Structure 1
């Protein structure tokens, strides 16, 4: 379930810059965001 959430947040950081290319910059921010919700509470 947590890995599936990475697919949703993979392009959310690209929506801010409005680019069709998704590099490793967005995947690194997606992993750190999912791990914070799991460790919270």
Structure 2
């Protein structure tokens, strides 16, 4: 789902995936959080 994510970008997709888990009050990262993490970090790093 992503494109050319280096070691720095993979850590953020994993970090952002855990960010939605905190809003869900869950200690685990659901699969639905990864779908929102790919569409975010890819567009997050593109800005600026």
Does the residue aligned with 2:22 lie in a helix, a strand or coil?
A: helix
Return the TM-score normalized by structure 2: 0.64
Structure with higher helix content: 1
Return the TM-score normalized by structure 1: 0.71
Does the residue aligned with 1:19 lie in a helix, a strand or coil?
A: coil
TM-fit CA distance, 1:26: 0.7
TM-fit CA distance, 1:4: 1.7
Q: What's the counterpart of residue 15 of structure 2?
A: 8
TM-fit CA distance, 1:40: 2.3
- Ranges in structure 2 where 5+ consecutive residues have no aligned partner: 1-7
List per-residue Cα deviations over 1:1-41 (Å, max 9, x = no partner): 21121121111001112112322111111111111123324
